[model samples]
Target: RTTRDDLINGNSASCADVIFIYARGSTETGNLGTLGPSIASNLESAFGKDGVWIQGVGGAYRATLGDNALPRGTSSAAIREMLGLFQQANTKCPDATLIAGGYSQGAALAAACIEDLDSAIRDKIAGTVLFGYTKNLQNRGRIPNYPADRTKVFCNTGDLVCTGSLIVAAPHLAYGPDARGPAPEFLIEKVRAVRGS
Candidate 1:
């Protein structure tokens, strides 16, 4: 059972076949960037209503051009709170599966949190799908040590935010043209592989 209500959300997926803890990209409350929720929705469609659990980490989400991939206190705090939920889930449902994915800054949070999870919890993770991770921040260890085969990171051909390139006005906003096109399929393939199906 989850100790906090804010970290996890779903209609009713306590003991679902797979539990996915999602973190939204940089923005305010309930705003799941262009691709976060889109890919999540696709996961729901593919995994079925009762077979999946989706949790969106919530807090003061703020990001700007000046920050340039720096982690903010509000977002960092929320991610820490989420770590608690990760522990609880592992204890409460040790038999259940855990997976993670996010967009932009949320992807950063997910990536960082995944690395912090205990080896056992980390082992239970099926896969992690990250979108728009800040590649320039790789030096800061924002990137986790997920297995090469089970981890998928998506950066658009010219996505300025991820690459820290000159073209910063448009590419960051373009993933899958609109509906997070290939991202969902990418996540689906990972989960299916984890499921051995």
Candidate 2:
């Protein structure tokens, strides 16, 4: 039932030049989900298979409805786990560039985790991508403290979740295909900027 479980529950045979640590949205079976894997493949095309490492936040949170309803409530556990993953990636691959992102509820989790990062760890992050972020309205369309130029938030026109509503409209479930074109472009550009490629 699980697919695209890379770092945490899957294999991480070696370090890559770039590491993307993603949090899956509510009800997703695996950590990557459809959105995370879509973006990861797009990135892999640009960075090559060995150039990127994908890790999905896993464990008891399970991206449940209760977690989604409370915003960052149950997500606190995922946030701490993500934080640890970020530090682990940095320590394992000191020269690697970090890309952080998530979809829907996972997007909220990622944003909160990134917010908790200290300058030392935060500086290693090259970019962030969020889709149907629940905090879009609360955060005024931006992830506070993270560089605006280095972030991409894909809130489709009718995505009620991003607009501060929990209606779970069609747009909220379609970011995997909708964001495929532009999200990867944004991350690639940020990667080049940091790596000078």
Candidate 3:
């Protein structure tokens, strides 16, 4: 609840070379099983033990009845909150890298936040990785535009939710095992180039 407080108060967890915000899928509670923890783990491996500051985008999208994309609602609120955090971190540490990504409804939220970003803030983004993005939204022109070269979308062959697949749980739960070999492997090159490494 006091995440930004920790940052404003100079907490060690907020002291990161890369600020990564991960959004979990709808209906997911507690631990972030999607690419959230996986990405953070990869970032830690890349930049030493604790080179990255990780935070979760919080809100209730109410997945029990399926996805909800209403304006100023749970998904929208989550986007705004995460964007604010990203802006704060970017303002606090201009040299630090900023990354955002998510799964399912969370992916949609991240994409929407990117659309409303200021050009300056937009430029500060290192990259965005989305898993299980909805084709319906993509069809409606709902995808992040900035950092085009660094944005990646992983929609498994039959995830139903994103790739219009026919499998329940399907490849959605297979990211760690066969999705892309870990978040860093999928995003390391981009992060490297951004950091001028």
Candidate 4:
């Protein structure tokens, strides 16, 4: 847990050049509780007070399910809900490059949104970074074809949610289920390098 002082005075928040979004762990069932502050904390450097935003459901949203919009209790629906918040944010923060950041359940939902973003809107998306995100084994080895899209995902070797969680996904699907192997930071750096950063 980080201190409030960090958010108000930390170097990260005070200097980041862009906006960052953190999804809260909740969905339709009314479980709008927070999962962690690190997401918001990390972005302080991006937008300062304006650098952070989060998605949340009002009640008992579970990691694997929920619905105020439908499919109640399913992870898919939650991600859509998060997207809704993103739309709202867009109207509120027009110039902020919308960034979807999530961990645990939020991460999974955010990952799904990566595919949902409109191409025009997608261009505005700085990127989607998943801290513990991954797909199924059957989807292994086939790289994603945002071939022109530049999203990044990061996964830890030992993260339980994705480490071996491939079995729980919608089998055989490519893209999300592919064996991208999980190293978002590297992808981000590569993009920066290409841009001469």
Q: Candidate 2 residues 18-79, lDDT tens each?
A: 88888888888777777777788888899998788778887644888678777463457778
Question: In model 2, where is the ten-residue run with the lowest total lDDT?
Answer: 1-10
lDDT of 4 by residue, 33-146 (tens): 233343444344333554344334322236543321232213565556656655655555555455545544555455556556666655555655544444412223111323
List runs of model 4 lying over 4 Å from the truth.
1-18, 24-36, 50-76, 134-150, 163-197
Candidate of highest lDDT: 2
TM-score of each: 0.77, 0.91, 0.78, 0.54
Cα lDDT tens digits, model 3, 1-197, are: 21213234445435767777666776776425455666666667778755666677653333332444354223555666767877777777777777777777676777777778887777777777877775433434245466557777777766766644223476666666432354566566666787866
For candidate 1, report its TM-score: 0.77
Clashing pairs in 1: none
Off by over 4 Å in 2: 5-14, 71-74
User: Per-residue lDDT for 1-197 in model 1, tens only?
Assistant: 21113225533336667777776655434545445566666777988867666666654334334333355412566568568767867765666678777666666667767777778888778777776666534524244566767776777767765655324556666655433666667667777776766
Q: Which stretches of candidate 1 lie over 4 Å from their true place?
A: 1-14, 28-31, 60-75, 136-142, 164-168, 177-179
Candidate with top TM-score is: 2
Write down the RMSD of candidate 2 (Cα, Å): 2.2
Collision pairs in model 2: none
